[PDB]
Amino acid sequence: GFLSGKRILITGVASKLSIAYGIAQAMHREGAELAFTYQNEKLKGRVEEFAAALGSDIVLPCDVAEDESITALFTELEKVWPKFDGFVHSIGFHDISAYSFVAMAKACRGMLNPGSALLTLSYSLEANVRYMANAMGPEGVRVNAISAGPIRRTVTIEDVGNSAAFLCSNLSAGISGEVVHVDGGFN
Amino acid sequence: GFLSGKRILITGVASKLSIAYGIAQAMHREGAELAFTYQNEKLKGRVEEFAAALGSDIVLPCDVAEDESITALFTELEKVWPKFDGFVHSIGFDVVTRDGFKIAHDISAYSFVAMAKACRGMLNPGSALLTLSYAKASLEANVRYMANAMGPEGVRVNAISAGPIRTLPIRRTVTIEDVGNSAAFLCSNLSAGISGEVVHVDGGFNIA
Amino acid sequence: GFLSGKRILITGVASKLSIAYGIAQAMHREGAELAFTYQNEKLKGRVEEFAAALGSDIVLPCDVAEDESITALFTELEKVWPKFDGFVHSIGFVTRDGFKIAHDISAYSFVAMAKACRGMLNPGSALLTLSYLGMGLAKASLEANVRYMANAMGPEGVRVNAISAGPIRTLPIRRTVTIEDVGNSAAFLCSNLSAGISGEVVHVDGGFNIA
Amino acid sequence: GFLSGKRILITGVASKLSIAYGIAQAMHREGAELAFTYQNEKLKGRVEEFAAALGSDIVLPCDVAEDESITALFTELEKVWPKFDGFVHSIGVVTRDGFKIAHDISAYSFVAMAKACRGMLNPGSALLTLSYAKASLEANVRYMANAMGPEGVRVNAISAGPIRTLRRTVTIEDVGNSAAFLCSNLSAGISGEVVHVDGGFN
């Protein structure tokens, strides 16, 4: 698929209903190798099962709230993926979600291949993927966000997933520093 | 490819360097059947050659400036494609502005909604229309209003705002391939969750 | 390729995105044997990896800031390449130029390295210096250092040129160069194809966008 | 070679010692398909022989001094090469001036030929002009490159020094290889530039 060759880290899988899980499924379908993080120890088993379902052995702990946890994650990740092609940051409703996104970027900055793409999930707040994209663009890294509608217009998890898959693939190479609104689907 | 099953009309091919042509190439690569329009009679031969390059025999005349030309286009098109899955609208264009009767360069905005109205009945469910863009308050919610109108009948409407496209303060150059793949995506079912949106395709920094 | 037979030393590789790295890739593709220098010890491992990717075992330290480091480089180099065919010199940066712009170190290191390896250069050798732009290092900065070097070393069979590259795509009339474009121009300017070109600064800016 | 796939028109071959001839030889060696023009009918036979030597059948008349001759050339050329990849252009106020508009300038033929073949140029095409204090070294090359860049065409010049006197001498091979390079994709990052080929320290 259009993600063949890519190694992408998915954060925010907690259940099979998670938006991040549908993104992972879409990315798997398009031939990406995936890695997953679990927030807490309770989730470790579930996430390992979901990861295995998609042929992944890389399940690492990470609390995106703590900077040391992020540094630790990327220290551990480098042992199996010395280089990778970006991550999906999906920790939902503070600049805590904004901060953790820039934190994780800084933490994995050296492990990113040229052509890498970071993606943050959104579902008076202006997301500032703009400044991240301008910073990391010169070294070949793209940064974007998906602002997803409620999962009358209903978005399917598959819809979000495919947009996410696209925005992490080379198909979307001309798109960086952008917030894509995925609300569409009236009835 | 991810456009297999789709029949997409490409407007605005005038040369192989046309942005519309690169979009057609990308869409062809992803398995879409294509149809092309020529503005000018002079262009008919060129466009037929380019169309043939992408395995298409459907080349029809259309001046988006004239409403009857649009109606005529879709009348002719229905004879080969009774139903199709959307189109790419890629056609942008001395004495002091105070002057007699003109539409006043309505084009693009108007022609986009005109073509939508004209082919409204020929669109399959899941169709997608795409318009290209390449003090300037030209940012519009034409796309927003079109998407809200046509969404209930299964049709998505989006625009690509492309940065400077390499022929082949943050300077950024795009690359036709980049524009083409975004366009292909926005006309495919991959982008089913995206309607009424203007996607900015500027990306491509330089080294420091 | 058109660089078969040549042994070329590439300085200024720090990452796969380094302009010097793209030049090395192009030169490798055209059949040159390469040697690399690392600026600092932190980079030694990276540069050795990149060098190995292009089949090179010669990775030597050089801080072009210090004269002894240059002398040391060519002392070490002569042990594996007693003779070689030139090098690529790629080191970085109102009346700002009034101020203590302690560059001109980049101009100096180029002539220093030339003096240092002068005896190891085969007839037909070519030295190349790279300049890049991402009042400001393109005013009083354009020099006949290249011209004077070429006139000095020409009689002994050595050509000297520079590439002035425009903005290099990461991958006024705005233009962008591809790393491949820079690389091939560099490869050409170090090959015998460019034998009639010495003491010259070649501007590699090209790459227009459509209207 | 590095010119495989290219179709390049060489103007200014008059003898085997012509600078344009050495350029043609170098370009042939690098796998280019060539076409040649003869200035006058006296030369037609010689140029056809030289062309044949390099496996070319396309020998057309052109006097770059006359606009009609240029238009004619590209009309004829399109019959065998409907599309091509560029050309090498190699040609060599008293106040009385019988009150005449002193034409306009000099080369001019370079920009004329560019306009005339503009439609037949593939993307990635490259035009090259040869030049061989009166610093009337202006760069019409700069303005040409800016004009034709957006449609994928590069424009450059070679300013060649004295040729092997056939001190710094240029060999015809040296000029040829620089010319070959400047018409190939190797030189894709070079447009609107005047490359000085003087080198060769006895």
Side-chain angles (χ1 to χ4, degrees), chain D residues 44-45 47-78:
Chain D
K44 179 178 178 177
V47 178
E48 280 165 348
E49 290 174 336
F50 302 157
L54 304 173
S56 170
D57 180 18
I58 311 167
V59 177
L60 296 178
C62 189
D63 176 15
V64 299
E66 331 279 291
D67 278 345
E68 325 252 336
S69 201
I70 298 163
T71 328
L73 169 72
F74 288 120
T75 299
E76 290 306 299
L77 188 63
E78 206 191 308

mmCIF file of all heavy atoms in Angstrom, chain D residues 44-78, unseen atoms left out:
data_model
loop_
_atom_site.group_PDB
_atom_site.id
_atom_site.type_symbol
_atom_site.label_atom_id
_atom_site.label_comp_id
_atom_site.label_asym_id
_atom_site.label_seq_id
_atom_site.Cartn_x
_atom_site.Cartn_y
_atom_site.Cartn_z
ATOM 1 N N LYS D 44 26.924 23.301 -47.974
ATOM 2 C CA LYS D 44 25.908 22.258 -47.843
ATOM 3 C C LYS D 44 26.505 20.861 -47.923
ATOM 4 O O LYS D 44 26.196 20.011 -47.089
ATOM 5 C CB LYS D 44 24.804 22.405 -48.893
ATOM 6 C CG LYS D 44 23.712 21.352 -48.868
ATOM 7 C CD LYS D 44 22.657 21.627 -49.930
ATOM 8 C CE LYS D 44 21.585 20.569 -49.965
ATOM 9 N NZ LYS D 44 20.559 20.935 -50.962
ATOM 10 N N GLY D 45 27.368 20.636 -48.916
ATOM 11 C CA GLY D 45 27.989 19.337 -49.127
ATOM 12 C C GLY D 45 28.927 18.933 -47.992
ATOM 13 O O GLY D 45 28.846 17.808 -47.514
ATOM 14 N N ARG D 46 29.818 19.855 -47.585
ATOM 15 C CA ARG D 46 30.737 19.630 -46.475
ATOM 16 C C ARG D 46 29.951 19.249 -45.210
ATOM 17 O O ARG D 46 30.231 18.232 -44.588
ATOM 18 C CB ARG D 46 31.625 20.856 -46.250
ATOM 19 C CG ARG D 46 31.674 21.784 -47.457
ATOM 20 C CD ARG D 46 32.805 22.789 -47.382
ATOM 21 N N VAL D 47 28.950 20.060 -44.843
ATOM 22 C CA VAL D 47 28.176 19.881 -43.624
ATOM 23 C C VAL D 47 27.442 18.531 -43.638
ATOM 24 O O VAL D 47 27.333 17.865 -42.607
ATOM 25 C CB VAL D 47 27.219 21.063 -43.365
ATOM 26 C CG1 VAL D 47 26.367 20.844 -42.117
ATOM 27 C CG2 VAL D 47 27.987 22.366 -43.249
ATOM 28 N N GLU D 48 26.935 18.134 -44.816
ATOM 29 C CA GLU D 48 26.284 16.845 -44.994
ATOM 30 C C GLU D 48 27.265 15.698 -44.745
ATOM 31 O O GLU D 48 26.876 14.682 -44.171
ATOM 32 C CB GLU D 48 25.698 16.730 -46.394
ATOM 33 C CG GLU D 48 24.370 17.430 -46.571
ATOM 34 C CD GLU D 48 23.949 17.630 -48.019
ATOM 35 O OE1 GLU D 48 24.797 17.435 -48.928
ATOM 36 O OE2 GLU D 48 22.791 18.040 -48.236
ATOM 37 N N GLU D 49 28.525 15.866 -45.185
ATOM 38 C CA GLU D 49 29.580 14.889 -44.966
ATOM 39 C C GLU D 49 29.905 14.765 -43.480
ATOM 40 O O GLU D 49 30.059 13.646 -42.986
ATOM 41 C CB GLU D 49 30.883 15.283 -45.664
ATOM 42 C CG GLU D 49 30.852 15.189 -47.181
ATOM 43 C CD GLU D 49 32.127 15.725 -47.813
ATOM 44 O OE1 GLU D 49 32.795 16.559 -47.163
ATOM 45 O OE2 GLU D 49 32.415 15.349 -48.964
ATOM 46 N N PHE D 50 30.045 15.916 -42.800
ATOM 47 C CA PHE D 50 30.386 15.965 -41.383
ATOM 48 C C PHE D 50 29.260 15.348 -40.556
ATOM 49 O O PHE D 50 29.536 14.580 -39.637
ATOM 50 C CB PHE D 50 30.679 17.396 -40.919
ATOM 51 C CG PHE D 50 31.790 18.099 -41.659
ATOM 52 C CD1 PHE D 50 31.855 19.483 -41.683
ATOM 53 C CD2 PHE D 50 32.750 17.395 -42.368
ATOM 54 C CE1 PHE D 50 32.863 20.148 -42.367
ATOM 55 C CE2 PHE D 50 33.761 18.055 -43.055
ATOM 56 C CZ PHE D 50 33.816 19.431 -43.051
ATOM 57 N N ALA D 51 28.013 15.699 -40.901
ATOM 58 C CA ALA D 51 26.804 15.168 -40.289
ATOM 59 C C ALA D 51 26.756 13.651 -40.401
ATOM 60 O O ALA D 51 26.496 12.975 -39.406
ATOM 61 C CB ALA D 51 25.575 15.796 -40.899
ATOM 62 N N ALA D 52 27.031 13.131 -41.607
ATOM 63 C CA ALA D 52 27.036 11.699 -41.882
ATOM 64 C C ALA D 52 28.085 10.986 -41.033
ATOM 65 O O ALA D 52 27.820 9.895 -40.532
ATOM 66 C CB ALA D 52 27.252 11.461 -43.353
ATOM 67 N N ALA D 53 29.263 11.621 -40.874
ATOM 68 C CA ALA D 53 30.355 11.148 -40.034
ATOM 69 C C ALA D 53 29.876 10.855 -38.612
ATOM 70 O O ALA D 53 30.419 9.964 -37.957
ATOM 71 N N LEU D 54 28.864 11.605 -38.142
ATOM 72 C CA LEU D 54 28.311 11.494 -36.794
ATOM 73 C C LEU D 54 26.902 10.895 -36.834
ATOM 74 O O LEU D 54 26.149 11.040 -35.878
ATOM 75 C CB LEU D 54 28.281 12.877 -36.123
ATOM 76 C CG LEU D 54 29.619 13.619 -36.038
ATOM 77 C CD1 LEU D 54 29.414 15.038 -35.524
ATOM 78 C CD2 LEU D 54 30.627 12.871 -35.179
ATOM 79 N N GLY D 55 26.555 10.232 -37.943
ATOM 80 C CA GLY D 55 25.328 9.459 -38.063
ATOM 81 C C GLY D 55 24.054 10.296 -38.178
ATOM 82 O O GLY D 55 22.990 9.798 -37.837
ATOM 83 N N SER D 56 24.160 11.528 -38.705
ATOM 84 C CA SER D 56 23.029 12.434 -38.869
ATOM 85 C C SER D 56 22.680 12.658 -40.343
ATOM 86 O O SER D 56 23.553 12.849 -41.185
ATOM 87 C CB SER D 56 23.298 13.757 -38.188
ATOM 88 O OG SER D 56 22.309 14.722 -38.523
ATOM 89 N N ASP D 57 21.371 12.686 -40.623
ATOM 90 C CA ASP D 57 20.779 12.871 -41.940
ATOM 91 C C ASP D 57 20.152 14.265 -42.027
ATOM 92 O O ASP D 57 19.790 14.689 -43.119
ATOM 93 C CB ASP D 57 19.761 11.748 -42.169
ATOM 94 C CG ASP D 57 19.010 11.723 -43.488
ATOM 95 O OD1 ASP D 57 19.480 12.370 -44.442
ATOM 96 O OD2 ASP D 57 17.954 11.046 -43.541
ATOM 97 N N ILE D 58 20.013 14.969 -40.887
ATOM 98 C CA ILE D 58 19.291 16.234 -40.827
ATOM 99 C C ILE D 58 20.271 17.393 -41.025
ATOM 100 O O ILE D 58 20.966 17.789 -40.097
ATOM 101 C CB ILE D 58 18.485 16.349 -39.512
ATOM 102 C CG1 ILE D 58 17.660 15.084 -39.254
ATOM 103 C CG2 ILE D 58 17.626 17.614 -39.487
ATOM 104 C CD1 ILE D 58 17.102 15.006 -37.856
ATOM 105 N N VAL D 59 20.335 17.913 -42.253
ATOM 106 C CA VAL D 59 21.168 19.062 -42.579
ATOM 107 C C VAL D 59 20.281 20.087 -43.293
ATOM 108 O O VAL D 59 19.796 19.838 -44.381
ATOM 109 C CB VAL D 59 22.395 18.647 -43.421
ATOM 110 C CG1 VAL D 59 23.247 19.839 -43.834
ATOM 111 C CG2 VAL D 59 23.235 17.609 -42.702
ATOM 112 N N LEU D 60 20.043 21.227 -42.645
ATOM 113 C CA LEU D 60 19.084 22.215 -43.110
ATOM 114 C C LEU D 60 19.799 23.538 -43.346
ATOM 115 O O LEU D 60 20.795 23.829 -42.702
ATOM 116 C CB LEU D 60 17.960 22.364 -42.073
ATOM 117 C CG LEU D 60 17.118 21.100 -41.884
ATOM 118 C CD1 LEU D 60 16.045 21.267 -40.817
ATOM 119 C CD2 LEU D 60 16.485 20.672 -43.196
ATOM 120 N N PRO D 61 19.328 24.371 -44.295
ATOM 121 C CA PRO D 61 19.925 25.683 -44.505
ATOM 122 C C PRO D 61 19.410 26.644 -43.435
ATOM 123 O O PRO D 61 18.242 26.577 -43.044
ATOM 124 C CB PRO D 61 19.373 26.061 -45.892
ATOM 125 C CG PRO D 61 18.016 25.411 -45.935
ATOM 126 C CD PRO D 61 18.200 24.101 -45.204
ATOM 127 N N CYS D 62 20.296 27.532 -42.958
ATOM 128 C CA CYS D 62 19.875 28.639 -42.117
ATOM 129 C C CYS D 62 20.923 29.749 -42.150
ATOM 130 O O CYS D 62 22.092 29.512 -41.880
ATOM 131 C CB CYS D 62 19.600 28.179 -40.687
ATOM 132 S SG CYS D 62 18.817 29.436 -39.636
ATOM 133 N N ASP D 63 20.486 30.951 -42.516
ATOM 134 C CA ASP D 63 21.236 32.175 -42.309
ATOM 135 C C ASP D 63 20.589 32.886 -41.126
ATOM 136 O O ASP D 63 19.515 33.463 -41.277
ATOM 137 C CB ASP D 63 21.192 33.059 -43.555
ATOM 138 C CG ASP D 63 21.863 34.415 -43.422
ATOM 139 O OD1 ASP D 63 22.616 34.622 -42.484
ATOM 140 O OD2 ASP D 63 21.659 35.231 -44.310
ATOM 141 N N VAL D 64 21.246 32.815 -39.953
ATOM 142 C CA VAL D 64 20.728 33.348 -38.696
ATOM 143 C C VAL D 64 20.574 34.872 -38.779
ATOM 144 O O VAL D 64 19.922 35.464 -37.921
ATOM 145 C CB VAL D 64 21.621 32.921 -37.512
ATOM 146 C CG1 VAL D 64 21.676 31.411 -37.344
ATOM 147 C CG2 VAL D 64 23.034 33.480 -37.609
ATOM 148 N N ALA D 65 21.163 35.506 -39.810
ATOM 149 C CA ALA D 65 20.999 36.935 -40.049
ATOM 150 C C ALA D 65 19.571 37.272 -40.499
ATOM 151 O O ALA D 65 19.110 38.365 -40.197
ATOM 152 C CB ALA D 65 22.053 37.436 -41.000
ATOM 153 N N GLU D 66 18.856 36.340 -41.153
ATOM 154 C CA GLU D 66 17.517 36.596 -41.689
ATOM 155 C C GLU D 66 16.467 35.860 -40.848
ATOM 156 O O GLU D 66 16.578 34.647 -40.686
ATOM 157 C CB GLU D 66 17.346 36.123 -43.146
ATOM 158 C CG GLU D 66 18.594 36.110 -44.020
ATOM 159 C CD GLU D 66 18.957 37.469 -44.584
ATOM 160 O OE1 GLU D 66 18.182 37.936 -45.443
ATOM 161 O OE2 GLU D 66 20.033 38.047 -44.227
ATOM 162 N N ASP D 67 15.429 36.591 -40.383
ATOM 163 C CA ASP D 67 14.362 36.039 -39.561
ATOM 164 C C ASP D 67 13.554 34.976 -40.299
ATOM 165 O O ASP D 67 13.089 34.033 -39.674
ATOM 166 C CB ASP D 67 13.419 37.122 -39.028
ATOM 167 C CG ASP D 67 13.926 37.846 -37.793
ATOM 168 O OD1 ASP D 67 14.883 37.345 -37.159
ATOM 169 O OD2 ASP D 67 13.354 38.904 -37.468
ATOM 170 N N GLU D 68 13.370 35.152 -41.612
ATOM 171 C CA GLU D 68 12.584 34.241 -42.440
ATOM 172 C C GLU D 68 13.276 32.872 -42.525
ATOM 173 O O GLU D 68 12.616 31.832 -42.571
ATOM 174 C CB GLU D 68 12.495 34.744 -43.888
ATOM 175 C CG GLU D 68 12.424 36.254 -44.081
ATOM 176 C CD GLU D 68 11.067 36.755 -44.519
ATOM 177 O OE1 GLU D 68 10.298 35.966 -45.110
ATOM 178 O OE2 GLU D 68 10.816 37.965 -44.347
ATOM 179 N N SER D 69 14.620 32.893 -42.563
ATOM 180 C CA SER D 69 15.457 31.707 -42.703
ATOM 181 C C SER D 69 15.362 30.835 -41.456
ATOM 182 O O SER D 69 15.349 29.608 -41.547
ATOM 183 C CB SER D 69 16.883 32.090 -42.991
ATOM 184 O OG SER D 69 17.589 31.008 -43.582
ATOM 185 N N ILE D 70 15.282 31.498 -40.292
ATOM 186 C CA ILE D 70 15.138 30.864 -38.992
ATOM 187 C C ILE D 70 13.761 30.210 -38.914
ATOM 188 O O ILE D 70 13.677 29.030 -38.589
ATOM 189 C CB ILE D 70 15.382 31.891 -37.862
ATOM 190 C CG1 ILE D 70 16.813 32.445 -37.908
ATOM 191 C CG2 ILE D 70 15.034 31.322 -36.488
ATOM 192 C CD1 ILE D 70 16.989 33.714 -37.103
ATOM 193 N N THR D 71 12.697 30.958 -39.251
ATOM 194 C CA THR D 71 11.335 30.435 -39.258
ATOM 195 C C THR D 71 11.226 29.217 -40.164
ATOM 196 O O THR D 71 10.556 28.246 -39.800
ATOM 197 C CB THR D 71 10.302 31.472 -39.717
ATOM 198 O OG1 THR D 71 10.749 32.762 -39.302
ATOM 199 N N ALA D 72 11.900 29.286 -41.327
ATOM 200 C CA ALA D 72 11.925 28.233 -42.326
ATOM 201 C C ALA D 72 12.599 26.999 -41.753
ATOM 202 O O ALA D 72 12.076 25.898 -41.897
ATOM 203 C CB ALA D 72 12.657 28.707 -43.551
ATOM 204 N N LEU D 73 13.751 27.216 -41.101
ATOM 205 C CA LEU D 73 14.541 26.154 -40.502
ATOM 206 C C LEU D 73 13.680 25.307 -39.575
ATOM 207 O O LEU D 73 13.677 24.082 -39.704
ATOM 208 C CB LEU D 73 15.726 26.745 -39.738
ATOM 209 C CG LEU D 73 16.462 25.742 -38.846
ATOM 210 C CD1 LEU D 73 17.281 24.757 -39.691
ATOM 211 C CD2 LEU D 73 17.329 26.470 -37.832
ATOM 212 N N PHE D 74 12.973 25.965 -38.644
ATOM 213 C CA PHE D 74 12.212 25.263 -37.623
ATOM 214 C C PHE D 74 10.933 24.646 -38.186
ATOM 215 O O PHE D 74 10.436 23.664 -37.630
ATOM 216 C CB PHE D 74 12.030 26.120 -36.371
ATOM 217 C CG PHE D 74 13.300 26.278 -35.580
ATOM 218 C CD1 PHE D 74 13.842 27.532 -35.347
ATOM 219 C CD2 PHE D 74 13.978 25.161 -35.117
ATOM 220 C CE1 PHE D 74 15.025 27.665 -34.637
ATOM 221 C CE2 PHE D 74 15.160 25.306 -34.411
ATOM 222 C CZ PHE D 74 15.692 26.559 -34.173
ATOM 223 N N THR D 75 10.438 25.195 -39.306
ATOM 224 C CA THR D 75 9.316 24.620 -40.035
ATOM 225 C C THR D 75 9.732 23.288 -40.653
ATOM 226 O O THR D 75 8.985 22.310 -40.576
ATOM 227 C CB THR D 75 8.765 25.592 -41.084
ATOM 228 O OG1 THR D 75 8.308 26.765 -40.408
ATOM 229 C CG2 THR D 75 7.590 25.021 -41.849
ATOM 230 N N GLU D 76 10.936 23.264 -41.249
ATOM 231 C CA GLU D 76 11.531 22.088 -41.871
ATOM 232 C C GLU D 76 11.911 21.070 -40.804
ATOM 233 O O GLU D 76 11.756 19.870 -41.034
ATOM 234 C CB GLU D 76 12.787 22.447 -42.670
ATOM 235 C CG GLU D 76 12.502 23.234 -43.930
ATOM 236 C CD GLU D 76 11.483 22.546 -44.822
ATOM 237 O OE1 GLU D 76 11.789 21.401 -45.251
ATOM 238 O OE2 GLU D 76 10.452 23.189 -45.148
ATOM 239 N N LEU D 77 12.436 21.558 -39.670
ATOM 240 C CA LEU D 77 12.964 20.700 -38.618
ATOM 241 C C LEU D 77 11.831 19.898 -37.984
ATOM 242 O O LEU D 77 12.015 18.710 -37.705
ATOM 243 C CB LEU D 77 13.741 21.527 -37.587
ATOM 244 C CG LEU D 77 14.507 20.712 -36.536
ATOM 245 C CD1 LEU D 77 15.597 19.837 -37.166
ATOM 246 C CD2 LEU D 77 15.082 21.605 -35.442
ATOM 247 N N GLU D 78 10.667 20.545 -37.793
ATOM 248 C CA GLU D 78 9.504 19.957 -37.137
ATOM 249 C C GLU D 78 8.990 18.736 -37.912
ATOM 250 O O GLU D 78 8.271 17.908 -37.356
ATOM 251 C CB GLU D 78 8.402 21.005 -36.961
ATOM 252 C CG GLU D 78 7.472 20.701 -35.808
ATOM 253 C CD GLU D 78 6.209 21.533 -35.696
ATOM 254 O OE1 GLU D 78 6.325 22.781 -35.721
ATOM 255 O OE2 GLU D 78 5.114 20.922 -35.560
#
